[PDB]
Amino acid sequence: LFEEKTIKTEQIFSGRVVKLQVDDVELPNGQTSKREIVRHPGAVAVIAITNENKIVMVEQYRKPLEKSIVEIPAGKLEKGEDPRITALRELEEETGYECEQMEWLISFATSPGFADEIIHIYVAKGLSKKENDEDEFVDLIELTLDEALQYIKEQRIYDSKTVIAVQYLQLQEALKNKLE
Amino acid sequence: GKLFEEKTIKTEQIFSGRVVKLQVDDVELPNGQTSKREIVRHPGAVAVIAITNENKIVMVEQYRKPLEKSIVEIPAGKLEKGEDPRITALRELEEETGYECEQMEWLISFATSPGFADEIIHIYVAKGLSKKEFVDLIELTLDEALQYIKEQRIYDSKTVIAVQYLQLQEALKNKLE
């Protein structure tokens, strides 16, 4: 199995969201090369479809993009917690929903060229509204598949986890029209 | 959009390397309070979904140091200043896979990791391919791709987006044939 073994590591930055480290790696050459590596805790994201066929989403400002975008609910993985608990808490905290099922769908790196961020997508079935930070600014949104598709066309939906989510719903519907 | 816009009140550059720049912005929240924003700057990429005449999706195995793993991905390359990304897509396909193509049309653009990076991927679909070490070259039927997702050999978001595009082709060809 191919490897670029780390022979040196320089910790460049250790912030609230990301760490940056520069790894010095051997090449088959015998020469060395720098590898810039953003380390990130990982994220749970939730595909939550209401009993009304509306997918639940949030709009928020993404400072690296200088724009607000429309995303599925997501939050960071916590150390020593079940990611499925994390998805349940993030669904309820971000969108005030409870669900019956929360089932792991797929996991993937978002930009593995420089980051080790992994997103774990969970599908939530059986949604109902729970009743009862000042620095958090999210906007709760519920869309039909066709509206989500139109939001893609408008680039209001503009990130990898949410594109994947929308495409999944498209597929679930197309295979729901492979039995009618 | 500009909902809940957070104006930069002060930028500090942390790092400027080969692939990533890192900066820290002080920002004004919508409620007037201050907060800090960690921002990786990255060039942005073009990626190609290529389906052969055998109806296989064209992929390449790539070593990904941040993952400590080799994963199976659709061909991709860095944007080039001044060059139409469609032209960049055609070159990247050809030098990564040896395929030329008769059609290269833009499908979708998205930010990979908007929580912290400004990396945008531009995905193009290459149709009508033909061949002109290529050892990392990997061609997969839909069902092998779905099995590669099960083994997590396919494991980044642009490639998953591509397998799902192949899946949607199959579940829509099945409505007309």
Side-chain angles (χ1 to χ4, degrees):
Chain A
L1 268 192
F2 184 84
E3 87 270 63
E4 299 183 340
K5 280 317 197 288
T6 298
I7 69 108
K8 303 174 173 183
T9 289
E10 194 192 359
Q11 278 291 344
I12 302 273
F13 176 92
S14 186
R16 171 175 55 82
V17 172
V18 292
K19 309 180 169 124
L20 172 66
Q21 85 193 50
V22 183
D23 274 24
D24 201 42
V25 298
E26 42 84 357
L27 305 158
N29 240 350
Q31 316 221 259
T32 51
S33 221
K34 303 308 190 78
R35 290 299 170 266
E36 304 161 11
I37 303 170
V38 178
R39 298 237 175 253
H40 190 283
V44 149
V46 174
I47 304 183
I49 313 91
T50 54
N51 43 45
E52 318 192 357
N53 238 14
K54 305 192 160 183
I55 170 158
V56 178
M57 303 209 192
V58 300
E59 188 169 352
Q60 58 199 306
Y61 204 73
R62 289 306 184 171
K63 186 48 158 72
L65 310 184
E66 295 287 338
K67 44 185 284 203
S68 59
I69 61 173
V70 174
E71 305 172 33
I72 54 175
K76 103 191 183 82
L77 271 179
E78 300 298 351
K79 182 161 199 179
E81 191 191 24
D82 193 319
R84 173 159 84 173
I85 274 75
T86 314
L88 289 163
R89 158 159 51 76
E90 256 288 329
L91 183 59
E92 104 182 304
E93 290 203 356
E94 222 182 348
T95 77
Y97 275 105
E98 293 245 316
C99 67
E100 294 153 359
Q101 309 284 50
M102 187 73 70
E103 313 186 89
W104 171 69
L105 180 65
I106 188 179
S107 297
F108 53 87
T110 54
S111 29
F114 68 88
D116 79 358
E117 180 179 46
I118 312 300
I119 293 193
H120 310 284
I121 290 184
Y122 285 77
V123 179
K125 300 179 177 294
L127 267 70
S128 66
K129 262 301 194 162
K130 186 204 65 202
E131 326 280 337
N132 312 349
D133 280 271
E134 37 71 51
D135 264 10
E136 299 185 47
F137 298 81
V138 319
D139 184 59
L140 188 276
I141 288 158
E142 306 174 15
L143 302 185
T144 71
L145 172 81
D146 285 353
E147 300 172 310
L149 285 170
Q150 172 64 23
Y151 271 38
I152 285 191
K153 190 270 226 163
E154 296 169 11
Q155 303 189 320
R156 301 194 60 192
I157 291 169
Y158 197 66
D159 83 310
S160 47
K161 70 177 179 292
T162 304
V163 168
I164 281 155
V166 165
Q167 281 182 325
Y168 174 79
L169 268 31
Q170 255 193 318
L171 282 167
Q172 297 311 100
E173 209 212 85
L175 314 180
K176 193 177 292 184
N177 294 344
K178 195 185 268 195
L179 318 188
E180 300 189 34
Chain B
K2 286 303 186 159
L3 191 59
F4 311 126
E5 183 182 21
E6 310 176 346
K7 270 73 155 69
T8 301
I9 70 200
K10 167 196 160 63
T11 295
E12 199 216 339
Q13 306 295 149
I14 303 314
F15 179 87
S16 189
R18 179 222 157 197
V19 183
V20 293
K21 296 160 174 28
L22 177 57
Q23 61 182 78
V24 176
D25 285 14
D26 285 288
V27 302
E28 180 168 344
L29 287 186
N31 66 357
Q33 313 310 140
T34 294
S35 198
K36 289 255 209 173
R37 293 289 178 277
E38 299 161 17
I39 303 154
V40 177
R41 305 249 166 240
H42 184 283
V46 72
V48 177
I49 304 174
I51 313 308
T52 63
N53 294 339
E54 312 188 346
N55 205 240
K56 293 183 184 178
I57 183 167
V58 187
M59 286 175 184
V60 299
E61 202 188 54
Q62 301 261 6
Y63 181 72
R64 290 307 180 183
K65 181 53 179 171
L67 307 176
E68 291 297 331
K69 235 87 195 300
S70 290
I71 62 178
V72 176
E73 319 176 358
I74 59 167
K78 176 194 179 288
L79 259 39
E80 221 50 75
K81 317 275 185 148
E83 182 180 46
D84 175 11
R86 179 192 182 282
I87 294 301
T88 321
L90 298 146
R91 190 169 73 247
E92 265 305 312
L93 184 56
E94 193 171 59
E95 29 193 49
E96 291 222 90
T97 69
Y99 279 106
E100 329 185 87
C101 80
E102 297 181 347
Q103 209 188 342
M104 181 71 76
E105 302 306 307
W106 169 83
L107 174 69
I108 192 165
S109 304
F110 56 93
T112 42
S113 321
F116 62 90
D118 70 356
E119 179 181 53
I120 310 303
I121 310 287
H122 302 286
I123 297 191
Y124 290 75
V125 178
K127 260 129 84 184
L129 319 185
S130 65
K131 268 267 194 170
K132 245 174 161 290
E133 187 80 42
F134 293 160
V135 289
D136 298 314
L137 194 63
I138 303 203
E139 293 183 23
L140 298 187
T141 70
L142 182 49
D143 281 343
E144 314 175 315
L146 291 183
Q147 172 66 32
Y148 269 43
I149 288 171
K150 176 191 188 198
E151 310 186 13
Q152 300 183 331
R153 297 177 184 273
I154 286 179
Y155 190 69
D156 71 321
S157 53
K158 68 183 184 312
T159 307
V160 167
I161 281 161
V163 171
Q164 287 200 133
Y165 166 93
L166 187 41
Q167 286 178 277
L168 279 161
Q169 299 271 111
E170 269 56 2
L172 256 298
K173 169 176 71 175
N174 273 211
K175 289 187 201 288
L176 73 97
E177 150 184 16

